[PDB]
Amino acid sequence: CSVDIQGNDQMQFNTNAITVDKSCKQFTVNLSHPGNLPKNVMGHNWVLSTAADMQGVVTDGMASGLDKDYLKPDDSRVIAHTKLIGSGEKDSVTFDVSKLKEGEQYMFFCTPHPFMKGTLTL
Numbered sequence: 001c002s003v004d005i006q007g008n009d010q011m012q013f014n015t016n017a018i019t020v021d022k023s024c025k026q027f028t029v030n031l032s033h034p035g036n037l038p039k040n041v042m043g044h045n046w047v048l049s050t051a052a053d054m055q056g057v058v059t060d061g062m063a064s065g066l067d068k069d070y071l072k073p074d075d076s077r078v079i080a081h082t083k084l085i086g087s088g089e090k091d092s093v094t095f096d097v098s099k100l101k102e103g104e105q106y107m108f109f110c111t112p113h114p115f116m117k118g119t120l121t122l
């Protein structure tokens, strides 16, 4: 009921599609950042939202700034998210699988690098 994801210096996630077993009651995303670049230069976060809510989350996120992990505080559109991390760091996030609906389209992405994205499916 977990998945390990890496966001590197070349602005790439090592997965573009996540599968969550609806049998799981909790899902865990373990984000790590291989490379040398610091959080202020190559910071990555892992954010989950519906495909439709993605742009809103990304724009309002960038405006919130680095100190707010490029995420709008208490954003109800963010189903789950990790903290912004720099190279060498690591951060995990666990969420209730019931926050997800079967058949709906979810996108996971990094707000400061929204092209680093993928799908999340139950």
Ligand SMILES: [Cu+2]
Binding pocket: 007, 011, 042, 043, 044, 045, 110, 111, 112, 113, 116
């Ligand atoms: Cu990023």
